[PDB]
Design an enzyme around this catalytic site. Structure first.
Site, PDB file in Angstrom:
ATOM      1  N   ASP A 100     -39.487 -14.433   4.164  1.00  0.00           N
ATOM      2  CA  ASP A 100     -40.530 -13.547   3.631  1.00  0.00           C
ATOM      3  C   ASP A 100     -41.875 -13.834   4.336  1.00  0.00           C
ATOM      4  O   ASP A 100     -42.935 -13.863   3.725  1.00  0.00           O
ATOM      5  CB  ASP A 100     -40.616 -13.621   2.092  1.00  0.00           C
ATOM      6  CG  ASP A 100     -41.297 -12.419   1.470  1.00  0.00           C
ATOM      7  OD1 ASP A 100     -41.408 -11.334   2.088  1.00  0.00           O
ATOM      8  OD2 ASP A 100     -41.791 -12.600   0.332  1.00  0.00           O
ATOM      9  N   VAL A 124     -54.145 -14.930 -10.963  1.00  0.00           N
ATOM     10  CA  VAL A 124     -54.293 -14.513  -9.560  1.00  0.00           C
ATOM     11  C   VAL A 124     -53.105 -13.589  -9.277  1.00  0.00           C
ATOM     12  O   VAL A 124     -52.882 -13.132  -8.147  1.00  0.00           O
ATOM     13  CB  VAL A 124     -54.319 -15.735  -8.611  1.00  0.00           C
ATOM     14  CG1 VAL A 124     -54.848 -15.325  -7.235  1.00  0.00           C
ATOM     15  CG2 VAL A 124     -55.208 -16.841  -9.204  1.00  0.00           C
ATOM     16  N   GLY A 125     -52.339 -13.366 -10.351  1.00  0.00           N
ATOM     17  CA  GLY A 125     -51.348 -12.287 -10.540  1.00  0.00           C
ATOM     18  C   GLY A 125     -50.164 -12.430  -9.609  1.00  0.00           C
ATOM     19  O   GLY A 125     -50.162 -13.392  -8.802  1.00  0.00           O
ATOM     20  N   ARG A 126     -49.101 -11.628  -9.690  1.00  0.00           N
ATOM     21  CA  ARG A 126     -48.400 -11.162 -10.879  1.00  0.00           C
ATOM     22  C   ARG A 126     -47.011 -10.955 -10.292  1.00  0.00           C
ATOM     23  O   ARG A 126     -46.866 -10.573  -9.124  1.00  0.00           O
ATOM     24  CB  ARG A 126     -48.955  -9.842 -11.460  1.00  0.00           C
ATOM     25  CG  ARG A 126     -48.644  -8.543 -10.687  1.00  0.00           C
ATOM     26  CD  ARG A 126     -49.904  -7.940 -10.050  1.00  0.00           C
ATOM     27  NE  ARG A 126     -50.309  -8.671  -8.850  1.00  0.00           N
ATOM     28  CZ  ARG A 126     -49.912  -8.364  -7.617  1.00  0.00           C
ATOM     29  NH1 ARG A 126     -49.102  -7.323  -7.409  1.00  0.00           N
ATOM     30  NH2 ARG A 126     -50.334  -9.094  -6.586  1.00  0.00           N
ATOM     31  N   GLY A 127     -45.968 -11.208 -11.055  1.00  0.00           N
ATOM     32  CA  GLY A 127     -44.682 -11.326 -10.393  1.00  0.00           C
ATOM     33  C   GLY A 127     -43.722 -10.213 -10.691  1.00  0.00           C
ATOM     34  O   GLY A 127     -44.140  -8.988 -10.913  1.00  0.00           O
ATOM     35  N   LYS A 128     -42.445 -10.642 -10.612  1.00  0.00           N
ATOM     36  CA  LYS A 128     -41.353 -10.029 -11.299  1.00  0.00           C
ATOM     37  C   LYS A 128     -40.420 -11.017 -11.983  1.00  0.00           C
ATOM     38  O   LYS A 128     -40.085 -10.852 -13.160  1.00  0.00           O
ATOM     39  CB  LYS A 128     -40.377  -9.497 -10.224  1.00  0.00           C
ATOM     40  CG  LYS A 128     -40.504  -8.077  -9.704  1.00  0.00           C
ATOM     41  CD  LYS A 128     -39.166  -7.657  -9.039  1.00  0.00           C
ATOM     42  CE  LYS A 128     -38.953  -8.272  -7.643  1.00  0.00           C
ATOM     43  NZ  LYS A 128     -37.566  -8.052  -7.092  1.00  0.00           N
ATOM     44  N   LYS A 179     -47.551 -21.722 -10.827  1.00  0.00           N
ATOM     45  CA  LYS A 179     -46.647 -20.589 -10.785  1.00  0.00           C
ATOM     46  C   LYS A 179     -45.656 -20.737 -11.932  1.00  0.00           C
ATOM     47  O   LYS A 179     -44.853 -21.695 -11.935  1.00  0.00           O
ATOM     48  CB  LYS A 179     -45.901 -20.583  -9.459  1.00  0.00           C
ATOM     49  CG  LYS A 179     -44.936 -19.393  -9.282  1.00  0.00           C
ATOM     50  CD  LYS A 179     -44.066 -19.669  -8.054  1.00  0.00           C
ATOM     51  CE  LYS A 179     -43.506 -18.390  -7.446  1.00  0.00           C
ATOM     52  NZ  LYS A 179     -43.051 -18.731  -6.048  1.00  0.00           N
TER      53      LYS A 179
HETATM   54 BR1  LIG Z   1     -54.223 -20.207  -3.025  1.00  0.00          BR
HETATM   55  C1  LIG Z   1     -52.468 -19.623  -3.525  1.00  0.00           C
HETATM   56  C2  LIG Z   1     -51.407 -20.538  -3.502  1.00  0.00           C
HETATM   57 BR2  LIG Z   1     -51.637 -22.349  -2.936  1.00  0.00          BR
HETATM   58  C3  LIG Z   1     -50.125 -20.141  -3.894  1.00  0.00           C
HETATM   59 BR3  LIG Z   1     -48.772 -21.445  -3.889  1.00  0.00          BR
HETATM   60  C4  LIG Z   1     -49.852 -18.851  -4.314  1.00  0.00           C
HETATM   61  N1  LIG Z   1     -48.683 -18.256  -4.733  1.00  0.00           N
HETATM   62  C5  LIG Z   1     -49.032 -16.984  -4.992  1.00  0.00           C
HETATM   63  N2  LIG Z   1     -50.363 -16.792  -4.760  1.00  0.00           N
HETATM   64  C6  LIG Z   1     -50.905 -17.939  -4.337  1.00  0.00           C
HETATM   65  C7  LIG Z   1     -52.221 -18.314  -3.947  1.00  0.00           C
HETATM   66 BR4  LIG Z   1     -53.681 -17.071  -3.990  1.00  0.00          BR
END
Ligand SMILES: Brc1c(Br)c(Br)c2[nH]cnc2c1Br
EC number: 2.7.11.1
Length: 327
Positions: free
Chosen positions: A150, A39-43, A62
């Protein structure tokens, strides 16, 4: 400068509450959780939909790209301190690779609809409802001695079907300590408060209230982002073209700040633009005198003048939402 509310929270609590550098983690079972899709994408991060292989429930995972131990500890301690608070994302587990020790934080899953799709569908009442839910989260973290730093639509998960909202991404969050001079490289450009833009380092919880204001303005006017600066200097210019430079000069004088001459010239001189100038036929069903007055009480240069989250919740704009939360 010192916070108007909740200033001495971390003095009164045990040192272990806020001394995140002292954190030891009780690591959970890494094998209990699998990663399904990005669900992407960091640093430093990548975020994934995952699965708990015991109960088959969805979770969010994460994985913290390796990482300054200090910021990992900060994020974990803050999440632990807030777990159970209203509309705060729930940290369900904390696990790591036994050999590389790569940590993964495991969160409750929320069926989010991205704000660019969701917000155009929201009614007048929907905005009132969800901003009230978001204020619950902010008053809670503030009351617990924490700044989010943020606030933005990207960090607000909403399952619209379930009327469920969670404030997420606590990776920039910090403990508030009176007179402490903080890093100003926080928040996202379009959501940065004037204090960050003029390098006022001893800011507080009220920073989150400016951000909330930017988000709110974007929602009711459908001008997103509302203050659309091309760099940190132009960001202050865009704010100045709306609130006017009179209030900015009074703010600078009060806190004994003098802008770099280049930035002073860029800002120039401007009159205050009335909020109603943003109303049009497309957004007028979302705009009311109470919405404008609420907006106006959040978007103040002087962080000391902004509504606290608690005060905000008493505003007449929320009266129907409060009425329904009744027996
Ligand atoms: Br549903 C969701 C959640 Br629950 C978290 Br913690 C998150 N952190 C980055 N993107 C997300 C999403 Br899309």
């Amino acid at each position: 400068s010192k916070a108007r509310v909740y200033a001495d929270v971390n003095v009164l609590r045990p040192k272990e509450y806020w001394d995140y550098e002292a954190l030891t983690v009780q690591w959970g079972e890494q094998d209990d959780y699998e990663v399904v899709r990005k669900v992407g994408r960091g640093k430093y991060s990548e975020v994934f939909e995952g699965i708990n292989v015991n109960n088959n429930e969805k979770c969010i995972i994460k994985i913290l790209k390796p990482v300054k131990k200090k910021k990992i500890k900060r994020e974990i301690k803050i999440l632990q301190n807030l777990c159970g608070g209203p509309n705060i994302v729930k940290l369900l587990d904390i696990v790591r690779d036994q050999h590389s020790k790569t940590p993964s934080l495991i969160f409750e899953y929320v069926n989010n609809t991205d704000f660019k799709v969701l917000y155009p569908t929201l009614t007048d009442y929907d905005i009132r409802y969800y901003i009230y839910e978001l204020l619950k989260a902010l008053d809670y973290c503030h009351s617990q001695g924490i700044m989010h730093r943020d606030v933005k639509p990207h960090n607000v998960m909403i399952d619209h079907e379930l009327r469920k909202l969670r404030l997420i991404d606590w990776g920039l969050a910090e403990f508030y300590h009176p007179g402490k001079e903080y890093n100003v490289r926080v928040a996202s450009r379009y959501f940065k408060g004037p204090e960050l833009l003029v390098d006022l380092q001893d800011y507080d919880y009220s920073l989150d209230m400016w951000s909330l204001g930017c988000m709110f303005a974007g929602m009711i006017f459908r001008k997103e982002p509302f203050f659309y600066g091309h760099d940190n200097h132009d960001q202050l210019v865009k704010i100045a073209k709306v609130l006017g430079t009179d209030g900015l000069n009074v703010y600078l004088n009060k806190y004994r700040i003098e802008l770099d001459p280049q930035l002073e010239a860029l800002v120039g001189r401007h009159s205050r633009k009335p909020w109603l100038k943003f109303m049009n036929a497309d957004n007028q069903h979302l705009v009311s005198p109470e919405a404008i007055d609420f907006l106006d009480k959040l978007l103040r240069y002087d962080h000391q003048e902004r509504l606290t989250a608690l005060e905000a919740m008493t505003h007449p704009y929320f009266q129907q939402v409060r009425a329904a939360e009744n027996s």
